[PDB]
Design a protein around this nucleic acid. Structure first.
Ligand SMILES: [Mg+2]
Ligand SMILES: [Mg+2]
Ligand SMILES: [Mg+2]
Ligand SMILES: [Mg+2]
Ligand SMILES: [Mg+2]
Ligand SMILES: [Mg+2]
Ligand SMILES: [Mg+2]
Ligand SMILES: [Mg+2]
Ligand SMILES: [Mg+2]
Ligand SMILES: [Mg+2]
Ligand SMILES: [Mg+2]
Ligand SMILES: [Mg+2]
Ligand SMILES: [Mg+2]
Ligand SMILES: [Mg+2]
Ligand SMILES: [Mg+2]
Ligand SMILES: [Mg+2]
Ligand SMILES: [Mg+2]
Ligand SMILES: [Mg+2]
Ligand SMILES: [Mg+2]
Ligand SMILES: [Mg+2]
Ligand SMILES: [Mg+2]
Ligand SMILES: [Mg+2]
Ligand SMILES: [Mg+2]
Ligand SMILES: [Zn+2]
Lengths: 102, 50, 57, 31, 69, 155
RNA sequence: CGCCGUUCCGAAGGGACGGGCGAUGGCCUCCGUUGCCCUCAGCCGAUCGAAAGGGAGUCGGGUUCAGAUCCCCGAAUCCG
RNA sequence: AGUUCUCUUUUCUUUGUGAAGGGCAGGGCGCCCUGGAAUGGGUUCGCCCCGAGAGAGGGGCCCGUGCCUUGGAAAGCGUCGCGGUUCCGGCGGCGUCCGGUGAGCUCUCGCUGGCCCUUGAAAAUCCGGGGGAGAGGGUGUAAAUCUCGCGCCGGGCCGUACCCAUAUCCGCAGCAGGUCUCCAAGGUGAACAGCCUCUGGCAUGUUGGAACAAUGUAGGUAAGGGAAGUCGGCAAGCCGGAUCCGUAACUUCGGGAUAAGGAUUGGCUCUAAGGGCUGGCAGCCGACUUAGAACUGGUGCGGACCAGGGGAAUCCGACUGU
């Protein structure tokens, strides 16, 4: 069938602390399909980026928690995990938020 | 123990009430000699024997 | 893993202290005390080894 | 409650080494 | 607890002199009508919403009716 | 401040050990004046009292090794401490074999690949340790059928 | 002072369906109760002896500084 | 939630449903009906079963602590987010899902067997049956009667905190002693062994600091020799697991026996064999074993832990037990 998930980086991007296009690029070559992260299984996984929302679609089984695994990996590579947090907004999406400090 | 007879639980209650210091106004009594309760008991130092 | 305690003051494994494990709506395992196993009647003939039928045990 | 606050609060307490004798009684000053 | 299958018997239950209150619980799939009698909590499970509304408006008077939320 | 009471109450409210109760070192004065489970519940909700996560005990190492052992690694002569019978009892080996082979005979008889007279003969041979495994029994049945057919043809 | 003995040298039953005579009553109608009589009656051993033996029937959730299968909420069950 | 310099669709946590009632799986039956079986068949790990009725059909009963359901989602829990007096059973969103496997451990139910010159309580209490003394009404507003379903009332007395033991008990004490039980995770491993770890717990056992003499107490190592020491090999030491091979005198033929004596043991990459479900074949599943081979390391591999030294004889007592 189809599986659709979204990442909402609105709060950071509108604060200009992460280029969503770069994040889309990051998921482009890193997302794995049967152990390979090059061709996205041959378009079997499709990525779309909106203004501040990134979407992922798949024609095969895809784990929503994988996007959280990669999102956290990307946040760490960009030294953001100490300020941002990936929290499930709904059954189909995650969003980035700020820890309650000051 | 938790398992207790009424007779034992009543003997123990009386031994509980006698284990207090003397009232301090007893000191001012006219012909008083008592300085303190000399019949104090401690559960660990000396045992009731029953 | 979760470990159990008796719910009564009988701490010994006697014939009247048998239990079974029960998961509860609170999502924990507790002891429920089982009833003894009943026996169906034995035939008055004293010969047939089996017990009778149509009778609650 | 986020579990990351344990770390953030723990690190904040460590900083009291430099303010011995004038440590804040309450950092949630408001109220 | 006892489970009643037909609206006919539930109405008889709700008219018993020892019936105290009727609680209606609305779930995603069914509407449950529970009457607190002396011994048991009788329940009727209705899957049709229209019948549940129809039964709700046809309860006997004087019986405390509660909607659970 | 002396927070022995608060550590004990929070532990009960969180249903954890006292070792997993975390009291905020910056808020000891606030936590100190909470002498009730109602007020502890408030501090738990506020974030001054938090339950610490379980200490990690990862099974990855043993899961990795279990995969290797399934392929035969770490299983040689030098890695055995119990006897061949203690590691794999003979009785269990025999029990599996009889069930496997008796199951096959029942299906061949039911499916009429053999008759009840051949079944009875093979049943007592199976119990006699004539056949090592399923295949040896199956090939032997095949030879028996060929001979039985040849005898029928001439007759 | 007591001891032995526990069914052994004992008139060891104060009970019962039913029936008959009265005395009373009450939803006085007819049913209760009671006293006596008739009839029937083995248990054959007073009593004590187990918080591990026998022995009907309670579980879930919440709650305290300290008690809960005991309190509160909910749902049951045994016995009379 | 942790890690993320590299790698890791990764690692960790967590992912409910009580009693009682109903329904159904499952398990058991020395229960019934048909029928009549040798070319004997059925059948278990073993057994064991049959003309006093086997196989094969069709039934009945008992337990159902398992699953569904009423309970019951309203509760509980996980997470995210809002309020409040803020010491509210506070309020809302989402979730509480789908499968596999096992000589596994713990409990429990059941079947079947072995052992006894051992045969492994009583009573309170409850129930069925046999009998048929009796009672009930004359065709009705029916009666006696009812172990059926509801409904009504009550359940008095005493115990209940906590310790339960390197500090709440007994040893004069917070005494290295003694003192009856229940539950019991991962790894290695034959394992409730030892060694490490999670849950939970603790603060080194009635004190600390600085030194590192002698003599101690407790552990180790030692060239060459190897009991010369000593009353005496006391003490320590050697052996040790497992696989394969091999095993004497004597014997009460059961043993002796792990006799004695050898070889092997790591890591890695493979090969072969050992099954289940569905429709001599095809497909899909799967769980640990055994054997064999190559390669490989400074010959090191039961690498820690665990873990018999052996042989030839004499005396005594048969033995196990005290
Ligand atoms: Mg003492
Ligand atoms: Mg019957
Ligand atoms: Mg054998
Ligand atoms: Mg008595
Ligand atoms: Mg008793
Ligand atoms: Mg008892
Ligand atoms: Mg009650
Ligand atoms: Mg038959
Ligand atoms: Mg259940
Ligand atoms: Mg809920
Ligand atoms: Mg009769
Ligand atoms: Mg207690
Ligand atoms: Mg020390
Ligand atoms: Mg110390
Ligand atoms: Mg001590
Ligand atoms: Mg030397
Ligand atoms: Mg040397
Ligand atoms: Mg010498
Ligand atoms: Mg000398
Ligand atoms: Mg020695
Ligand atoms: Mg010898
Ligand atoms: Mg001897
Ligand atoms: Mg003796
Ligand atoms: Zn009989």
């Amino acid at each position: 069938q189809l599986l659709k998930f979204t990442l909402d980086c609105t709060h950071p991007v509108e604060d200009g602390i992460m280029d969503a296009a770069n994040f889309e690029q990051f998921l482009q070559e890193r997302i794995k399909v049967n152990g390979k992260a090059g061709n996205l299984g041959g378009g079997v996984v499709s990525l779309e980026r909106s203004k501040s929302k990134i979407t992922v679609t798949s024609e095969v089984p895809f784990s929503k928690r994988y996007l959280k695994y990669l999102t956290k990996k990307y946040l760490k590579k960009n030294n953001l995990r100490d300020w941002l947090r990936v929290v499930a907004n709904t059954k189909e999406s995650y969003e980035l938020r700020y820890f309650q400090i000051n | 123990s938790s398992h207790k007879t009424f007779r034992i639980k009543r003997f123990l209650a009386k031994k509980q009430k006698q284990n207090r210091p003397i009232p301090q106004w007893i000191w001012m009594k006219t012909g008083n000699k008592i300085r303190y309760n000399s019949k104090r008991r401690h559960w660990r130092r000396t045992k009731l024997g029953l | 893993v979760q470990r159990l305690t008796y719910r009564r003051r009988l701490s010994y494994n006697t014939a009247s202290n048998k239990t079974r494990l029960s998961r509860t709506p609170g999502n924990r395992i507790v002891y429920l005390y089982t009833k003894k196993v009943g026996k169906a009647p034995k035939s008055a003939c004293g010969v047939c080894p089996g017990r009778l039928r149509g009778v609650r045990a | 409650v986020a579990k990351q606050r344990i770390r953030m609060a723990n690190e904040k307490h460590s900083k009291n080494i430099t303010q011995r004798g004038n440590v804040a009684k309450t950092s949630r000053n408001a109220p | 607890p006892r489970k009643i299958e037909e609206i006919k018997d539930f109405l008889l239950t709700a008219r018993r002199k020892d019936a105290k209150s009727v609680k209606i619980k609305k779930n995603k799939d069914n509407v449950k009508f529970k009457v607190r009698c002396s011994r048991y909590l009788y329940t009727l499970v209705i899957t049709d919403k229209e019948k549940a509304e129809k039964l709700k408006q046809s309860l006997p008077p004087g019986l405390a009716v509660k909607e659970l939320k | 401040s002396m927070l022995r009471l608060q550590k004990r109450l929070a532990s009960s409210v969180l249903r954890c050990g006292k070792k997993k109760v975390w009291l905020d070192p910056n808020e000891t004065n606030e936590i100190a004046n909470a002498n009730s489970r109602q007020q502890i519940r408030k501090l738990i909700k506020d974030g001054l009292i938090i339950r610490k996560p379980v200490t990690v005990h990862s099974r990855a190492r043993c899961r990795k090794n279990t995969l290797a052992r399934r392929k035969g690694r770490h299983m040689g002569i030098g890695k055995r401490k119990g006897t061949a019978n203690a590691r794999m009892p003979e009785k269990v080996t025999w029990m599996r074999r009889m069930r496997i082979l008796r199951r096959l005979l029942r299906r061949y008889r039911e499916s009429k690949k053999i008759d009840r007279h051949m079944y009875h003969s093979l049943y007592l041979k199976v119990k006699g340790n004539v056949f090592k495994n399923k295949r040896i029994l199956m090939e032997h049945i095949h030879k028996l059928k060929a001979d039985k057919a040849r005898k029928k043809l001439l007759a």
